Symmetry: D2
Subunit: 381 residues, 4 copies
């Protein structure tokens, strides 16, 4: 119900302790220097936080997706870039392989990646089409006994750190979505070149680059599932990723609210603490309401996924509400902090820049509203 | 969890069937003619919907407050005035008596009122002070063996139909809240006169009047609890009423959304259904999300109350979010219907006028935000 | 510039004096009883307020459109239904005849209507299509020497009081807009039947009905301009009407703000006036800014029209901003008044219901945003 | 009226030409490297853009404040940091000296600063109090024939480039505002030390530091006006600065809208340009409406100042509306650009970070709403 089980409570406490011990001292350094936190990722792999959905047989933690959402929220509260790296590795790489790959592919592509030594990446977007995922131009000709890949992916998270890749290329151009086919591409491999890192406004610990495939050949076993199923795999992986991104936005909004409340209590204006002003109280009330409401939606989406029931509309609602709430709460936290919120000495601006991204990737807000509207009208029809 | 138990599902189905059978044909007539639906209230008392929180020993249904929230949402979806009458009788009259009254008072003031033959009313507000509940000017002098009541209450719901009253009068003026004392006043009684009915913008089935007490004397047993506890009784009854009003606003928003979606699918513009337009889809998506989020907040508040845990901040959040969401959804439904939404032939304007009230009574939105802000700052401190 | 000329100032003062003398005592009676204010319309015709754009040669006042906007704002501040009647008679009937009709048609259809004895109506909308104005199904066969009209118009303002009608019927069905042709139809005439009055949520002084044409024949001179120009005539008349409706929404928002400020200063809560609370001050500040900004937009649109320059985007912006600001200000005024705002004794709910309409007729907000977007993209291209 | 005079049109064209020639190529470099654009400031001084309000006798341009607002909007459209430097030098330094200083002080402190070789700074805020300007703790003891200054100012714009300073120190502590006294402090002078530059989220061309006064002595003539008038001088200078900041926010919103519209027309999604989507059109319409509405308010405030009439409420409204509109438009521009808007290669994120500041300095939005509310209630009383 509303309360959490003992395992979930213990995981929440452990994640909060780890976050306050490790991520908070280094978050500013990671943001400023664009430094990939290798040691923190290794420690998270040691704690099993990178393989929560993975069964314990394959080396994972064997936990439900609600526990994953809680851990993602706590980690993103600690550090946003570490949060998005964890979210990518947990959902976007591990989920499709467990859900669709054969047992040999699971053994060869999940077990090394549970320990945290290696991480994965999700390669769907292209420079030509960002939202229209079905219009991917990457071609995968089945010449000989190998899949020859030609094309250029873009915006690939963890491109400079991943040891594997889930690449979606259209085997058949005529088939807009049917042609789409997934492939498990090891990194580094001949024929694959990594693009230059992109300077980003917000999350800067993670490395974002453009994968370029030039006559890249992979063995025939590297195809995920069967040809044609690529679009469905992409959609389901996107739903799970949307749940993860909603958790990340919740964490960002929570830490922004905590910093704002602490500063408002500490700061003195007109001979009184700022909390005595009614405007500040109303701002805090609205922020808390938005944050809690979103958290509820997220938890509902996670529990619906755990009960093996359809959750696409719920996940889209959770992602949209969490992203918008995080942006509004971060903006109001900057406004409450005032002048001190603008300088980089205080962490409010980092929360603002990190919260801005949650409305862009994993489907923009317009795409989320399209999904919600379609499912709503289908429900009434 | 997210799912509902079998009893709750059966109650939801029964309430929906009763609503579609009875309330929908007569809602327009009730709104237009200011007609109190006596037969519908009697049938609801027959179904036990007026005594859900009451134990079965005293003649109630013995159901949890979550079931009460579900039934309130369904009834308010059927008809808003019937919804507010049910909410008043269930929470604001029955709850304080069960929570604080002695067993003899329970037998003499709850058992006749479970059947639906008689209903109660909550008398707190005064013309002088609406939000400042602690500034009530009604005086209750303890002369002789009877409590002599002098004063004028205002805005009393069901004043023209109630057979009992929960009246709060300040026994001690010096004590702003300590002086406040509750009293169980039977109606009609000598010394009590009912004010004229007030024409209202929205809910017009219910009768709202001003109770006037002129030397009204009641026996000494009619006092609820002990003197001084009146303010706490009022606050707890207000929390339960806020949960009920949140359920009512949810019902209004739900029926407005249903009518808007049906009309949008039926209406043809520019050679296409209105749902083909992206603006309509985005409006429907935003409306859906709002309602669902509010519902979760409401259900969380109800479950927290059922588990015997503090729920004041949760109830305030649920009431605020539900009221604002209901107003926004009703306005957008009128906008979607366009010209046909403006005339009284279509039920959109009735939903608008009924949804406007949920931000005013049971504490305005500013008071709710004050409560949320106070509890938030207390949580951080 | 920002200041007003002496003629405009004198007209503003005269309109305000007339409004406070006449419209304010009878506004509640007009709203409640659906009473057409014949005497007030006659007095306005005596003051020349119904023929402001009309040259003095034809019996008008010969004033610029800025003066018309000011007078419309003041009258709608006095009474909303009188405001919409004045707006219809000034813009939607008189403007197209002066702009496109020949001199004989001006003499036979403008000079009697300047005095205020008779008023006109604008017949464009149909039950089939409300926003898609080009899809009108009314047919005008040119049989013999007369135009035979068949079809059914809908939502015609002043249908029960108009002595003339501007009816737009598609002469050629193949021509979606080219077929559209305007006609000056006298009322009453054989073959024309008036539909039943429609009960409306808001403005109820004006009479809204559905014109039904059954073999209605008019002389050949009654056609406005030449066939095919009907759509352009409709668009320009709509622009002028949008300016008028923006002025009306400004008046409604202004009177709502005045009542809210007066009540907030008078009402006492927590031992202080409501204006001492910071939340009330912030609400009043937001309301004020909105109204003033909208007024400027309106005044800019009116001055651009007076200088014989294109004003379509400006008029659309003014109408959209004025309507949204009026709705928000009326809602906040009801919220500020609290319980007393809900009853019909206070005039806040009347302002709410009257302000709701300004987002529906003369093009809904979505159509206004489409016009603004089209003109913006055309400006950049 | 709505149109601009020939001088204003010529100044607008010259400012736009200069902006597109100089500021646009170097804006990204200035933002990235925190580089003070010395050459651009010198060229602006050559064009007279730094001394617009200054009479031509003292070496200024002798232009009205409307021309200053237009030039500020164009320059801030070119580059935001250059815009805020120009705004500070024009209003916050030059205005108080011309308005209150004697002729000798004008000759010794305005004529060298019109040419653009030297610039000024406005020193009011302190680390202790940011919004409560009357609680400044800087002390100015009148020992001997010199004013000995002790205290620490904060957030001083152009602290590392100014050759003069307007410092406000409380001569009399007992007098909260009466004690406040202004002083013209040359820079550099013995006893004055410049604090370290502060890394800021947005505008980074300008240098922001903390002035520290330790036994700084100035001649007796350096006091501006007479003791006690400091608070009034600060308030009037703040009003003029609010007009300038509103112009800057207008420029930022305008360039963000231009970039967003151009990208939306260029980008192709789902086989169509983005402008074909109705959601994009509605976003563009809302952005254009907000921008134009604000621009109007700003121009009204500037013209009211030029006509020697009170403009405090108008300036506060203009600043608030311009800041909020700029933030909303920048956020929507980032959303429209999508993924490409997030990287630093595109200029959308720079517009976002620069537009965030306009709600903080020159009085936060809460202070603006307090000023508007006070003037509104004073108007009704
Ligand atoms: C880039 C930049 C440049 C600057 N340049 C200058 C300059 O040239 N000269 C100068 O003098 N200063 C300058 N400042 C400082 C400026 O005055 C302050 O940063 C800003 O105006 C508010 O200061 P604060 O945040 O410290 O106020 P705080 O009092 O610390 O603000 C706390 C919060 O409480 C709110 N608040 C406070 N009192 C009330 C109230 N009564 N009612 C409601 N809400 C309230 C505020 O709005 C704010 O959100 C600059 C600041 C920045 C960031
Ligand atoms: C009080 C009143 C007075 C009136 N007076 C007159 C009068 O004097 N003369 C006259 O001719 N008419 C009059 N009308 C009718 C008026 O034209 C319509 O009521 C109104 O303009 C819209 O009509 P509709 O709701 O039927 O349109 P509908 O097409 O039925 O509206 C459906 C909804 O879809 C939206 N929509 C439609 N097309 C699009 C699109 N392409 N993109 C986005 N959204 C879209 C609309 O905004 C609306 O929300 C009056 C109406 C009222 C209520
Ligand atoms: C349909 C209806 C039914 C009702 N039924 C009942 C009933 O059964 N029992 C009962 O006891 N009462 C009932 N009431 C009365 C109800 O308590 C009040 O109408 C409502 O809760 C607020 O009262 P008010 O508007 O008079 O408060 P006011 O104090 O007059 O409100 C003035 C405004 O100031 C705001 N305000 C006041 N204090 C503050 C503050 N400290 N901070 C910020 N904002 C503030 C309020 O939000 C409000 O907007 C009913 C009212 C209505 C309309
Ligand atoms: C930090 C970051 C990390 C990323 N990581 C990954 C990753 O790991 N894997 C991956 O595959 N991609 C990744 N991406 C790319 C991501 O898919 C896109 O950036 C984003 O989802 C949208 O792409 P776009 O802006 O290019 O779409 P565009 O089509 O260029 O967006 C244009 C605009 O139009 C809107 N729009 C488009 N179509 C419609 C429509 N039909 N209706 C309404 N509005 C519409 C969009 O919402 C958007 O506002 C990442 C991007 C970023 C910024
Ligand atoms: C555009 C978009 C919303 C929809 O895709 P489309 O190709 O444009 O439209 P479609 O017609 O393919 O959608 C419905 C089809 O897909 C399938 N599908 C769509 N959503 C699905 C879901 N959530 N689960 C399962 N199947 C789904 C349906 O089965 C249907 O095919 P059918 O006709 O055989 O039943 C999708 O590409 C998208 O989500 N874009 C944003 C996400 C993103 O970029 N994330 C970045 C990762 S960080
Ligand atoms: C104004 C208002 C919000 C708070 O009341 P106040 O008298 O103004 O302020 P107080 O200082 O009394 O509040 C705190 C006190 O009340 C008690 N209290 C407040 N809220 C409580 C709650 N939810 N549960 C229990 N006790 C509560 C606290 O114990 C404390 O007293 P203590 O110091 O002995 O601990 C309240 O009057 C109100 O809710 N008004 C709107 C509700 C309404 O009108 N409903 C209409 C019915 S349809
Ligand atoms: C739908 C709507 C917005 C546009 O009309 P459309 O027929 O759907 O679209 P169109 O292609 O006709 O629009 C452009 C055409 O009309 C003409 N036009 C459009 N707006 C115009 C304007 N403001 N001024 C002049 N001409 C205009 C253009 O010349 C063009 O024709 P061309 O190709 O020969 O140049 C219009 O019908 C409308 O305003 N509806 C809402 C208004 C309303 O109902 N008011 C009620 C009165 S109270
Ligand atoms: C807090 C604040 C809003 C008002 O100041 P206060 O000291 O708190 O309140 P006061 O009582 O002094 O306000 C009214 C007094 O000041 C004077 N005053 C206020 N605003 C004025 C104005 N716009 N023009 C002239 N005089 C003004 C009045 O004369 C009155 O004094 P009186 O009683 O002798 O008539 C002001 O300090 C402020 O604007 N802060 C934000 C601005 C800022 O920080 N800008 C940074 C520069 S980039």
């Amino acid at each position: 119900s509303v309360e959490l089980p003992e395992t979930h409570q213990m995981l929440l406490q452990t994640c909060r302790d780890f976050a306050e011990k490790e991520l908070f001292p280094i978050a500013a350094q990671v943001d400023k220097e664009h430094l990939f936190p290798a040691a923190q990722v290794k420690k998270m792999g040691g704690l099993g936080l990178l393989a929560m959905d993975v069964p314990e047989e394959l080396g994972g933690a064997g936990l439900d997706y609600l526990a994953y959402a809680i851990a993602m929220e706590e980690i993103s509260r600690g550090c946003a870039s570490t949060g998005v790296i964890m979210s990518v590795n947990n959902s976007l790489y591990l989920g499709p392989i467990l859900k669709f790959g054969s047992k040999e592919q699971k053994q060869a592509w999940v077990t090394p990646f549970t320990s945290g030594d290696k991480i994965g990446c999700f390669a769907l977007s292209e420079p030509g089409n960002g939202s229209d995922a079905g219009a991917a131009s990457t071609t995968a000709r089945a010449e000989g006994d190998s899949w020859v890949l030609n094309g250029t992916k873009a915006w690939i998270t963890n491109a400079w750190e991943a040891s594997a890749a889930v690449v979606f290329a259209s085997t058949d151009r005529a088939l807009q979505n049917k042609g789409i086919s997934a492939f498990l591409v090891p990194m580094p491999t001949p024929g694959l070149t990594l693009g230059k890192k992109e300077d980003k406004l917000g999350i800067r610990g993670s490395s974002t680059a453009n994968l370029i495939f030039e006559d890249c050949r992979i063995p025939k076993d590297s195809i995920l599932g069967e040809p044609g199923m690529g679009f469905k795999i992409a959609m389901q992986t996107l739903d799970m990723g949307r749940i993860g991104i909603a958790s990340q936005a919740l964490g960002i909004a929570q830490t922004a609210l905590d910093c704002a409340v602490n500063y408002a209590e500490n700061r003195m204006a007109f001979g009184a603490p700022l909390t005595k002003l009614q405007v500040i109280q109303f701002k805090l009330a609205d922020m808390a309401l938005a944050l809690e409401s979103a958290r509820l939606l997220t938890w509902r989406a996670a529990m619906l996924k755990d009960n093996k029931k359809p959750f696409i509309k719920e996940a889209a609602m959770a992602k949209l509400a969490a992203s918008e709430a995080a942006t509004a709460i971060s903006h109001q936290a900057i406004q409450i902090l005032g002048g001190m919120g603008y300088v980089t000495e205080m962490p409010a601006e980092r929360h603002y820049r990190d919260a801005r991204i949650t409305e862009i990737y994993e489907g923009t807000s317009e795409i989320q509203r399209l999904v919600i509207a379609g499912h709503l009208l289908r429900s009434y029809r």
